[PDB]
Every structure is written in structure tokens, then in C-alpha cells.
Design a protein around this ligand. Sequence first.
Ligand SMILES: CC(=O)N[C@@H]1[C@@H](O[C@@H]2O[C@H](CO)[C@H](O)[C@H](O)[C@H]2O[C@@H]2O[C@@H](C)[C@@H](O)[C@@H](O)[C@@H]2O)[C@H](O[C@@H]2O[C@@H](C)[C@@H](O)[C@@H](O)[C@@H]2O)[C@@H](CO)O[C@@H]1O
Ligand SMILES: [Ca+2]
Ligand code: NI
Length: 141
Amino acid sequence: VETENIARGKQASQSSTAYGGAATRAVDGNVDSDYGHHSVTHTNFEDNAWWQVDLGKTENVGKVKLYNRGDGNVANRLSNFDVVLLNEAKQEVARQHFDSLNGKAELEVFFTAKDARYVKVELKTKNTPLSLAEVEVFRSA
Ligand SMILES: CC(=O)N[C@@H]1[C@@H](O[C@@H]2O[C@H](CO)[C@H](O)[C@H](O)[C@H]2O[C@@H]2O[C@@H](C)[C@@H](O)[C@@H](O)[C@@H]2O)[C@H](O[C@@H]2O[C@@H](C)[C@@H](O)[C@@H](O)[C@@H]2O)[C@@H](CO)O[C@@H]1O
Ligand SMILES: [Ca+2]
Ligand code: NI
């Protein structure tokens, strides 16, 4: 993949916002995973929480990297989730399911040369907030 993080500074949004955990914290160029350092997102405790970045145009995506929240022993909240690519009309062009990050600070998701404008993370879990320290997106080589 290319090295430029194309998610950086892009428009981001999420299902809801709590504890001041603004969606733009996942694309601020800071992977610091300590919620107290203000670079980690947070939605409401809700069903099927989600977070999205608009790349602003259609790009050929090869890698999405998720960085989990690291403080407070709540890393497990990022489990049973999909990483979704959508085209400009917001139709799904790819989707990968993950049970867990297994303790790891991050997860690398590789997509097979998908032309997509939106990258979405979707929890499939009830009454669970979605918190991401950072989402980075890289073009196919
Ligand atoms: C229980 C409630 O959510 N607490 C909120 C505070 O967050 C908790 O603070 C604790 C120390 O005071 C400790 O750090 C806990 O780990 C932390 O709880 C975690 O994070 C929050 C944001 C939620 O996701 C909880 O479900 C989770 O268990 C919060 O404190 C502020 O953020 C934390 C991370 C830390 O930086 C702290 O020093 C900050 O004051 C406060 C203020 O918004 O609000 C709740 O009380
Ligand atoms: Ca961040
Ligand atoms: Ni600190």
C-alpha cells in the first residue's frame, strides 16, 4: 500500500457522541490510545454503534488500520464488529467481520483493491460504545 494516511483530517461522523469523544479524534493524526489524552472517540452505550470517515472522493483502498482504546481495561468493547467500505452512493463494496483484536493495540485490515469513498466501523453488539484511538486508510500500491 501507499504510505500516505488519506483518512487524516477527513470528515468523520459516528452513531452518537458521549464523554466528549468527538468522531474527528479517530482521524486527527494521533494514535495515543489513552482516552484521557483526548484523541479517542466515544459513542453512547447503544446497539450497533458505528463510526465513519468520508474520504471525500472515490479511492482505491488497500488497507484500513484500526487503533484500539488502551486505558481503563475496556479494550474488549472493540469486538464482534465489521469494517465496511462504501461507494460514493453509500452502497457496500466490501465488508470484513472480526471477533476480536486479541489484546493487540491495533488491527490491520487489507482490502482487495476496492474503489470506495467511505470507510465505516460497525459494532454488532448490544449496549456497547464504539471508541477508536485512530483509523488510518491507505491507497493500494
Ligand atoms: C464510570 C464513568 O464512565 N466514569 C467517567 C470517567 O471515566 C472513568 O474515570 C476513572 C478515573 O476517574 C477511570 O479512568 C475509568 O477508567 C474511566 O471509565 C472509563 O472511561 C469512560 C470515559 C467510560 O468509557 C467508562 O465506561 C470507562 O469505564 C470520566 O473521566 C475522564 O476520563 C477518563 C478516561 C480519565 O481520563 C479521567 O481522569 C477523566 O476525568 C469522567 C469525566 O468525563 O466522567 C465519568 O465519571
Ligand atoms: Ca486519534
Ligand atoms: Ni496521561
